[PDB]
Write a protein that holds these residues in place. Structure first.
Motif, short mmCIF file in Angstrom:
data_model
loop_
_atom_site.label_atom_id
_atom_site.label_comp_id
_atom_site.label_asym_id
_atom_site.label_seq_id
_atom_site.Cartn_x
_atom_site.Cartn_y
_atom_site.Cartn_z
N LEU A 66 0.87 -1.17 0.00
CA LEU A 66 0.00 0.00 0.00
C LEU A 66 0.92 1.23 0.00
O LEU A 66 1.83 1.36 0.83
N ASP A 67 0.69 2.14 -0.95
CA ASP A 67 1.53 3.32 -1.10
C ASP A 67 2.99 2.86 -1.23
O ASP A 67 3.30 2.09 -2.13
N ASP A 68 3.87 3.30 -0.34
CA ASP A 68 5.28 2.90 -0.42
C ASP A 68 5.70 1.92 0.66
O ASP A 68 6.88 1.84 1.01
N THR A 69 4.74 1.16 1.18
CA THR A 69 5.02 0.20 2.25
C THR A 69 4.48 -1.21 1.98
O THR A 69 3.37 -1.38 1.48
N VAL A 70 5.26 -2.21 2.33
CA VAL A 70 4.84 -3.58 2.16
C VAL A 70 4.75 -4.20 3.56
O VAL A 70 5.69 -4.08 4.35
N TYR A 71 3.62 -4.83 3.87
CA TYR A 71 3.43 -5.48 5.18
C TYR A 71 3.43 -6.99 4.99
O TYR A 71 2.82 -7.49 4.07
N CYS A 72 4.12 -7.70 5.89
CA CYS A 72 4.18 -9.16 5.84
C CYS A 72 4.52 -9.73 7.23
O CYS A 72 5.05 -9.02 8.08
N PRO A 73 4.21 -11.02 7.46
CA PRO A 73 4.48 -11.68 8.74
C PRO A 73 5.97 -11.64 9.03
O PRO A 73 6.80 -11.99 8.17
N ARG A 74 6.33 -11.22 10.24
CA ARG A 74 7.75 -11.14 10.58
C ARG A 74 8.51 -12.48 10.52
O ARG A 74 9.74 -12.49 10.48
N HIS A 75 7.80 -13.61 10.50
CA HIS A 75 8.52 -14.87 10.47
C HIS A 75 9.20 -15.14 9.11
O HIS A 75 9.85 -16.18 8.93
N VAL A 76 9.06 -14.21 8.17
CA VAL A 76 9.71 -14.34 6.88
C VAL A 76 11.22 -14.34 7.12
O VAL A 76 11.99 -14.77 6.27
N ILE A 77 11.63 -13.78 8.25
CA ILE A 77 13.05 -13.68 8.55
C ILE A 77 13.58 -14.95 9.23
O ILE A 77 14.80 -15.08 9.37
N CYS A 78 12.72 -15.85 9.63
CA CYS A 78 13.30 -17.02 10.30
C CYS A 78 13.84 -18.03 9.30
O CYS A 78 13.51 -17.95 8.12
N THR A 79 14.67 -18.97 9.78
CA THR A 79 15.21 -20.10 9.02
C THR A 79 14.47 -21.33 9.56
O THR A 79 13.48 -21.18 10.28
N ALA A 80 14.92 -22.54 9.24
CA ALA A 80 14.27 -23.76 9.73
C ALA A 80 14.48 -23.98 11.23
O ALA A 80 13.57 -24.45 11.93
N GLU A 81 15.66 -23.64 11.72
CA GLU A 81 16.01 -23.81 13.13
C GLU A 81 15.55 -22.66 14.03
O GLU A 81 15.72 -22.73 15.25
N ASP A 82 14.97 -21.62 13.45
CA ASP A 82 14.53 -20.47 14.24
C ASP A 82 13.09 -20.56 14.68
O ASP A 82 12.69 -19.94 15.66
N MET A 83 12.41 -21.52 14.10
CA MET A 83 11.00 -21.60 14.15
C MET A 83 10.42 -22.02 15.49
O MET A 83 9.29 -21.87 15.70
N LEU A 84 11.25 -22.47 16.39
CA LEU A 84 10.78 -23.01 17.67
C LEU A 84 10.87 -22.00 18.79
O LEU A 84 9.99 -21.94 19.64
N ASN A 85 11.92 -21.21 18.79
CA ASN A 85 12.09 -20.22 19.84
C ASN A 85 12.78 -19.01 19.23
O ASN A 85 13.82 -18.56 19.71
N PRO A 86 12.18 -18.44 18.17
CA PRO A 86 12.77 -17.28 17.51
C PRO A 86 12.83 -16.04 18.37
O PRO A 86 11.92 -15.76 19.14
N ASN A 87 13.91 -15.30 18.24
CA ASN A 87 14.03 -14.05 18.95
C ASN A 87 14.06 -13.09 17.78
O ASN A 87 15.11 -12.68 17.30
#
Lengths: 302, 5, 303, 5
Positions: free
Chosen positions: A32-53
């Motif tokens: 929307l306009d000049d911003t894209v919104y998405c779930p922050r878990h896009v930054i996790c890897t496979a091993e981050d998925m259990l207790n991501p910081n």
């Protein structure tokens, strides 16, 4: 007039769907306009998925760590930040298909339209209701995330939902467009479970009125009930307690059919206690609860 | 138990 | 397993408002042509049995007001094609998607974009019933509303709304103006023939159930096509043909379950009910999902 | 009884 579970036309939302990638994870984003919104878990890897910081995971990214694509064209990320469970990526170009919109956090029992997407492309649109326990009984496969829920009032799109996960029971959970989860859930792969769910009493009555304005009156009776006595029975059947506000909300529909709210409750009461005896209402065999009074007066003739 | 989408 | 409609953005871009005199309804604008139901040239008391041909003669391009958003589209031509009017405009629609016109067959589904005054209000999935009607949801001013399917990137227009029948069901034409069923666009006494349950789609739905992992209804037996039809026809199911069996081939292959084996399972479900159990969270056998819709929803097909 | 939409 007939009666269908319709969603809002999805075009205004389709023109905002983009693809967002980080590392090797790709999901949908809303532009929307000049911003894209998405779930922050896009930054996790496979091993981050259990207790991501997430905080720790994000500080290790730059703007060029995010690949956002509109169709086959790459949109450059010139800024980023986390808001609750979402990522707000600033892009150097603006979305001209951006409709008039607002971010709204809906209430349980309220309905909305979902545009399921995969890799930034529209798959389908369906209408559903936010369950009383905050979960959604949707239809999402892997890579759906980023898909959004919304309502349309005139030319203004009210975004209310963004998808984040599936709970062990096969139902789904997510956030509003500010990133706050609907329900007591967190975005991590840990044992989580939806709370007890109830049938949305307000919607069933709206629906029974839908059947009546539509010419069907078989389920009505000559009885009446008090609000208290109706709740004493409805609660036995796992139905949401009905409040005086709820009865008022039904005011318009009440006056349109000539059936008192409490008399319609009397009818519902009987249906709960005796089943439908093989008959159907608006073609359905069970009591339908995904139509709000508002959806009813909108789809049905005044 | 919970799966991230 | 929700009943999903196709993303409607592409069709929303083709909807306009068409007004003739005091009559306003919706039109479909593709390239430099706007299609709308011919009854738009009819007035109040002129719908019992209108002579469309003679009613059109008394019209000229100036008789039609076509609006897109807030802009007026200039009509430079008009001709009638069966039950539709084909208005030529001086502007090719900039949002014209790749498309085609196809005539849908009984049992097949499509999405409906319900419109009023040229503005889309809702979209839902429908199935062309065996009796050639559709269980839709339309109010006054919805006519010219359109049904469609998307195959790849191509919009396949298959339906345009014209009438509501006495039983609360609906009738309309393909985009050539030809009606589905024996209906005619005149407010005479017309009735839908009795309907049946779309057996092909129910079987397709059972496969979807299995694909999802909901397979308790399956059994160790099989059945002949003839023995299945004898049972199914009591519950008012459409007779199953070999052609239907063949259409179910891809799903049967995906699950490795022979069609006649699923029929044996369906048979047992009809004669013994579900025992309060549920299939895909439903307490009844769905008949408005085709083998394609099933493939589409379970495969995450995008457009 | 058919009704034109």
């Amino acid at each position: 007039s007939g009666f269908r579970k319709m969603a809002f036309p999805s075009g205004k939302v389709e023109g905002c769907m983009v693809q967002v990638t980080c590392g090797t994870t790709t999901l949908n984003g809303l532009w929307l306009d000049d911003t894209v919104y998405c779930p922050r878990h896009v930054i996790c890897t496979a091993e981050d998925m259990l207790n991501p910081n997430y905080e720790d995971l994000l500080i290790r990214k730059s703007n060029h760590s995010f690949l956002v694509q509109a169709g086959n064209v790459q949109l450059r990320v010139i800024g980023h930040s986390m808001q609750n469970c979402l990522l707000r990526l600033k892009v150097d170009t603006s979305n001209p298909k951006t409709p008039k919109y607002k971010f709204v956090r809906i209430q349980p029992g309220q309905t909305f339209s979902v545009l399921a997407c995969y890799n930034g492309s529209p798959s389908g649109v369906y209408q559903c209701a936010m369950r009383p326990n905050h979960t959604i009984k949707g239809s999402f496969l892997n890579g759906s995330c980023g898909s959004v829920g919304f309502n349309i009032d005139y030319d203004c799109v009210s975004f209310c939902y963004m998808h984040h996960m599936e709970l062990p029971t096969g139902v789904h959970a997510g956030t509003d467009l500010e990133g706050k989860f609907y329900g007591p859930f967190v975005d991590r792969q840990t044992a989580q479970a939806a709370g007890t769910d109830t049938t949305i009493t307000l919607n069933v009555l709206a629906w029974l009125y839908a059947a009546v304005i539509n010419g069907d009156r078989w389920f009505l009776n000559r009885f009446t009930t008090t609000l208290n006595d109706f709740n004493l029975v409805a609660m036995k059947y796992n139905y949401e307690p009905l409040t005086q506000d709820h009865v008022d909300i039904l005011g318009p529909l009440s006056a349109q059919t000539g059936i008192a709210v409490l008399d319609m409750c009397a009818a519902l009461k009987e249906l709960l206690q005796n089943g439908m005896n093989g008959r159907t209402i608006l073609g359905s065999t069970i009591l339908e609860d995904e139509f709000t009074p508002f959806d009813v007066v909108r789809q049905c003739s005044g | 138990x919970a799966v991230l989408x």
